Amino acid sequence: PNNIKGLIPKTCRLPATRNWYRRTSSFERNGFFNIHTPVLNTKMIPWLLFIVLTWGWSSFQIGGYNYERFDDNGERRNTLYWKLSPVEFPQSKLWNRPS
Amino acid sequence: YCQMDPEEIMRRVPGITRKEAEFITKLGLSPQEQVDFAYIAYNIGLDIFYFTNQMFVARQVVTNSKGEKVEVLWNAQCYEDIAQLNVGFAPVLESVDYHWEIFLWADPPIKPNNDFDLNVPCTWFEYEQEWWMESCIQEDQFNLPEDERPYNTPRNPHC
Amino acid sequence: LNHVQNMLEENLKYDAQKYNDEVAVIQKTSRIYKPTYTIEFNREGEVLVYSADPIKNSVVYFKYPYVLYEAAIPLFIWAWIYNPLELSKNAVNSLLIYPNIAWIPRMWYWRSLQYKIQKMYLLRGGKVAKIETQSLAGDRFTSWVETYQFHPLTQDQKNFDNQDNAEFLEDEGQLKYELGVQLDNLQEMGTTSQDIVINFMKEGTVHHPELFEAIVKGYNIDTSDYVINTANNLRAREGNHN
Amino acid sequence: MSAILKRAAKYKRVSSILCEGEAHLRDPFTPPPVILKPPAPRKDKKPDDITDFPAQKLIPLPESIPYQEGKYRPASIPMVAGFFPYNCYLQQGKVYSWCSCGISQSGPWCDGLCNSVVTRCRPVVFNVSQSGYYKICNCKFSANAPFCNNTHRKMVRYHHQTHRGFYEIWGAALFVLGWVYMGFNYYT
Amino acid sequence: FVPLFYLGFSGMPRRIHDYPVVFMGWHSMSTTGHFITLVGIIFFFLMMFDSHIERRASTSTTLGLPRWYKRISYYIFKIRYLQHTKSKMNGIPGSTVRLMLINRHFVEYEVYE
Amino acid sequence: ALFFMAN
Amino acid sequence: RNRYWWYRSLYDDYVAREAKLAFGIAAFIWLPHYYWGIHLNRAFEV
Amino acid sequence: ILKVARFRVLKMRPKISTSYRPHGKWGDFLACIIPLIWCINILTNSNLIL
Amino acid sequence: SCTTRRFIDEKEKLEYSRGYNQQELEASKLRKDFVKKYIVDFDTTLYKTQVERDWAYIAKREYRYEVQLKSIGYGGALANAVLLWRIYANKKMVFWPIPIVGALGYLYFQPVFFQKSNKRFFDMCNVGEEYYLGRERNKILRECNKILNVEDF
């Protein structure tokens, strides 16, 4: 339909300012399709940061904190005297390292 | 596809001809690289119409000290690996020839050693040996603008 | 698959074939501007038509949309640490999801700061313009772009601005506002990208207002009346106050 | 075109000299700028036509530059190679070559590596009238050609003012403060 | 080979074909990994077969210029590389035609004017 | 070593 | 120290920019590890 | 990694490596400080448990 | 133990949730006054015996983590909420909500977390009748037992 109320008719092409999403791929003028564009570097920065740095340096600490906070470090609670009992240690062997 | 003016290329490199400047503009280099390539090609006598292949990557006509007007062919090379060397006799880039016997006539290859007494001072773009290194250090260096650099400081008493 | 007859498909095939045949690489244009004065190119055959320091004049750290996210980060970290909502083990980690994705808008903004033009020269021939920009980490980028690629945007940058009739320069000749220009194809660092928007800040010096206006309006400028100034003032990697 | 020409009468141009000044004022070997005008356009363009533009004075690279007495603008941007001056004992009447490029392996002196880099920075061959300890410039930016005039302090301040330099210095400071915090909390 | 590290930390001797029940889990994962490796081996041989159906002449990526010791070598490589890529991108439509074909792909509408 | 356990 | 000496000590290769950018991020990634290690050391002592 | 993943490919600002051979200032000395510390650590720990 | 600590924390949360009576409030006030004075307002390293110093510092560390740090965190959360509100309202970065609202949040939450965990800190001072700290705690404990008509440890 031509005349629809509430809709602005598109008389001319709109700029890139109005785009909701930013393309990570482009076209060379001779038809070559660029997958590795300058936008791809900025898009890959957060994924690489999380995979290489953030996950490998916080995941085990989070796991141990949650294990102590919720599971009481896996204690067998039916024990008599804390001062005479061995301590159920929190998690100490990192599972996010290869060894 | 941004082409430098052939007149401007001729002006920057005075001895270069119109056809060479136009052909250089018809290559894919950015205008800075177009002017630089024109400078190099004119100064070293490079033939810019020579198509790069796996026999020789470049051709250059130069007159020696006896005025013989010889030609020099810059070969296609390989990095330490004859197995990666394209031993071909065609002006093409592909590796079509496969030789079962690399040294067919049993003639050995050679790595010529140069006598130190018979060496010559480096003049094949000698000013580029450290270039890369320096340019890797100056990319992350911030330089004080001349508006802020102190000037006309007092002279040293003994110099 | 091809034996199925679709008129829209046939029209698309005809359009593609006709564009391949009739539309050529070499396109004739009548947008030519002849400046009223002699153009004084530098020793490198290009006249500086715009200069600025976009990073110096921009707010880098305390920008409103992003300080909000970066100030919300500690709240999420505290909510995970103390668990005031008495959530299970998975829900608190879902809370911890947020700090990883809250600095990304600032990354995009800091990237956008490098698309504000720092320098623009007009090369000889009047068909190429050299654009120099600089990132927030000191990297410098140079791009040669044809003059016809430039399309001015409006003041609000929401819609395209009419070429051949647009006033982004005041009466004196300086920029009236931060002008947005869209480029159909910009080759940045050797990779072609489509529909790239660049900005000319108001706090920037517009040398040669006629040449700047012609370049932005996508004109092929006639540089026949020229002189060359043999001034070797500049140097490579010259300090520029960012 | 027509719209630009309508307003072109009132447009005013601005000078192109910004944060760089004039090289010929602060540097010898650079002739003052000369306005070269093109000749008449050629009637016929031939494939073997060399340029007809007026010739330009060509100054070769000097082997070394003299001591410019407190007025030294580097011909090209040098590598800093240190923000501290050397305290070197110079003998009276002995010719010293000072490294201007900054890439010399032989400390402050030229060695030979300026010939192996793309730069117009040539060594400053100078002679002192009296032997003694001198502050030889090592940032290669001093107005005194081989001597230190405390320009390295300005260079350090400018580096700190930059966004990336500010981040670098604060990151190093926070690394050291993390070491200090660990040492302070070592008994908890 | 990571679950083998896990089992080694738990006290698993080497040359035993029967082990305590508490190891089986990681051992299964380890065995899984081996089979993944085997699949990769299959692909290896497949590519060799696929390499002789293809029957193409190899072209060196260096174009005969392994080292850019000088900027003239960089220029020669850049020129030859651009010519080579232009020759490769023949029979593949330009950017405008390709975008026209991609954007106008959908040709299924119920009602027309 | 000296401060390997860091605490 | 000596910028030129420290900019080509590592086999004549320049990684000084990445070394400089490493300190800022490395100043914070060790905090969770350090605090949980404090917890583990206290548990061992107990 | 970021640099080599973002700015070292041919289409993203490659470098003209013009260096014939490396000239280093105490190379291995910097590359052996980190391992040596490790050795120290390991040795000390072993001795204690021994 | 972790189970003992979790049980203490959750029982304190339940007690604070249900209410605190009147005589319980009086006993809590006595316990809080004793703990505040003898631990927070005193340098625990100034006690004569090593047992007193060690266990008073343990009690002070428990106070620091369970009252000081928790109150700082909750006040900082309140300050962050107010800061986000003010940043959204002013469409720019502001700094006033951090100090003032952080201090107000700390002053609001420190009494809450002290009232919640008063018994925990009071009992941790039970070093024995042989020491001055233990004698004072036992005097306060006898007063609280008189108030609540019960017997504690």
Ligand SMILES: CCCCCCCCCCCCCCCCCC(=O)OC[C@H](COP(=O)([O-])OCC(O)COP(=O)([O-])OC[C@@H](COC(=O)CCCCCCCCCCCCCCCCC)OC(=O)CCCCCCCCCCCCCCCCC)OC(=O)CCCCCCCCCCCCCCCCC
């Ligand atoms: C320790 C320092 C302390 C003092 C700091 C002082 C200021 C420092 C910054 C100054 C500027 C330095 C240069 C920056 C990059 C410039 C280059 C560029 O083009 O950038 C665009 C560029 C986009 O890519 P590009 O332009 O295509 O290519 C880059 C260049 O071409 C070529 O560039 P390149 O390749 O050479 O360089 C690559 C490098 C370039 O980047 C850097 O060098 C940046 C290094 C880190 C900077 C950290 C300081 C940020 C300064 C602003 C803070 C404002 C605070 C006040 C306002 C908000 C709070 C109220 O990339 C990276 O480092 C990778 C991304 C690293 C992200 C780190 C995120 C930390 C988050 C911390 C908060 C969350 C913690 C918990 C969760 C943890 C896991 C996420 O962006 C980046 O690369 C950087 C991305 C990250 C930027 C935003 C960081 C936000 C931090 C928020 C902290 C909030 C704390 C909690 C609240 C506290 C108050 C209540």
Ligand SMILES: CCCCCCCCCCCCCCCCCC(=O)OC[C@H](COP(=O)([O-])OCC[N+](C)(C)C)OC(=O)CCCCCCCCCCCCCCCCC
């Ligand atoms: C030596 C090097 C080792 C590592 C080298 C690299 C190889 C390994 C790479 C791993 C990559 C990550 C895999 C796991 C992913 C999930 C994380 C996880 O479950 O961790 C467990 C941990 C621990 O979980 P837990 O609390 O259950 O701990 C286990 C507890 N026990 C052991 C007691 C059972 O969980 C978390 O850390 C959860 C919080 C983080 C969630 C992050 C979500 C956001 C991700 C953002 C991505 C980047 C931005 C994208 C932006 C896009 C914008 C459009």
Ligand code: FES
């Ligand atoms: S002048 Fe510096 S290396 Fe020679």
Ligand code: FES
């Ligand atoms: S080193 Fe001091 S001014 Fe150069």
